[PDB]
Amino acid sequence: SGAIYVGNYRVVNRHLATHNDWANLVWEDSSRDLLVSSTTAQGCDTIARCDCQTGVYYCSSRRKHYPVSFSKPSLIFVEASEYYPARYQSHLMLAVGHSEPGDCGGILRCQHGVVGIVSTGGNGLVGFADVRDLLWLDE
């Protein structure tokens, strides 16, 4: 679990969105596993606007942060689950690192701010849904 709070927005994994998230829907993209809902309170996370390929992510299954090198956002094949059929997930970045299903929502950050959130994993690889292109999150 985990979310990004920037301005009047809450960014979560689309497969983990709540009833409240859907009742206050701003935008969602099944192909990205992202959903953004509105909030009454003001958020202070800073979104990175960069092409960083190194950063640190929070791994709840280990109660630890890990430094990683990650790939640029791309279309990557993702196995079927109770949430989605087998498909290509877009805007996804991979790194060599530990992750388990309850790890989705963990933040990946570089020196510039929030890069994205944990969205996939398995086989010693963790996948992060990028948020750096969503420029509207700041306005």
Ranges of beta strands (E only) in 53-112 are: 54-59, 64-69, 74-78, 87-96, 107-110
Task: Clarify whether 33 is annotated catalytic.
Answer: yes
Gyration radius from the chain CA atoms: 14
Closest residue to ligand A1BOB: CB criterion: 121
CA dihedral 64, 65, 66, 68 (to 10 degrees): 150
Residues 80-119 that bind Zn ion (CB under 5 A): 110, 112
Task: Clarify whether 45 is annotated catalytic.
Answer: no
Of 88, 93, 70, 113, whose CA–CA distance to 30 is shortest?
Answer: 88
Element (H, E) at 111: none
Binding site for ligand A1BOB (CB under 6 A): 15, 33, 78, 81, 83-84, 89, 99-101, 103-104, 118-122
Q: Of 29 and 100, which CB lies nearer to ligand A1BOB in the complex structure?
A: 100
Residue 52 labelled as part of a binding site: yes
Q: Which stretch binds Zn ion (CB under 5 A): 21-29, 42-50, 59-67, 82-90?
A: 42-50
Q: Give the residue numbers annotated as catalytic, written as ranges.
A: 15, 33, 104
